[PDB]
Amino acid sequence: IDVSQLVNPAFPGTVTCDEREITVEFPSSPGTKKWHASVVDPLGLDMPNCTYILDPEKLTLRATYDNCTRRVHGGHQMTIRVMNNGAVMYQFFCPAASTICQKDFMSFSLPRVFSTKVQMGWSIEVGDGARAKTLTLPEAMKEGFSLLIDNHRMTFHVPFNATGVTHYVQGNSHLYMVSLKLTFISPGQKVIFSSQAICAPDPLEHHH
């Protein structure tokens, strides 16, 4: 008998640990159409400042890390209560650049990792809030990213004028940044971290 499944049951759907929020994704079923869900402390008591979003069409529950989770060793823990019309509780856990500059380019190199059936993978993202991860080679090269690939590494070369490079100016200082997402995939759980490849020039050098 596996007692750890009696005290800590496995959620029958997916969970996503985002940079700013937790998305719990329930399995689609007519029986799950008769469920209600709420965020609770390990005793089942409502957490006071926690506000969360329910989407009945996508069957998702979204909660911020602040006020909705408890800090545990290695990261954050959240508890939800699921009720019919017998009740069940589930707990979730979320854990807490080699850039090269050039006169007209920035360059960086990233591992081709791609690997208990756990996967690790990288992706390039562009835009602010509305956009998505353009990881796919057609999209990345449509944004101007030239790519060198060997058995062990992936190396990117992008001009500063490229659409995939966000450019910031605060007075005389200039900053070039490509955002990256490191994605881990496990059965029933996705975990996403954020990262950047950043190349700031010298103001005198940038002024030419």
Ligand X SMILES: *[C@@H]1O[C@H](CO)[C@@H](O)[C@H](O)[C@H]1NC(C)=O
Per the CB < 8 A criterion, the answer to whether 166 and 176 are in contact is: yes
CB of 64 to ligand X, least distance (A): 6
Q: Which is nearer to ligand X, 20 or 152 (CB)?
A: 20
Q: Which residue is nearest to ligand X (CB)?
A: 161
Q: Name the 3-class secondary structure at 17.
A: strand
Nearest CA among 75, 104, 108, 109 for reference residue 92: 75
CB of 135 to ligand X, least distance (A): 24
- Site for ligand X, residues 84 to 113, rule: CB under 6 A: 104
Cα-based angle 22, 23, 29 (whole degrees, multiple of 5): 150
Which x/- pattern, by CB under 6 A, does the window 108-147 give for ligand X?
----------------------------------------
CB of 79 to ligand X, least distance (A): 15
Compute how many other C-beta atoms are within 10 angstroms of the C-beta atom of residue 199. Answer: 21
- Site for ligand X, residues 32 to 71, rule: CB under 6 A: 48-49, 51, 66-67
Per the CB < 8 A criterion, the answer to whether 24 and 60 are in contact is: yes
Per the CB < 8 A criterion, the answer to whether 16 and 184 are in contact is: no
CB of 83 to ligand X, least distance (A): 24
Residues that bind ligand X (CB under 6 A): 48-49, 51, 66-67, 104, 159, 161
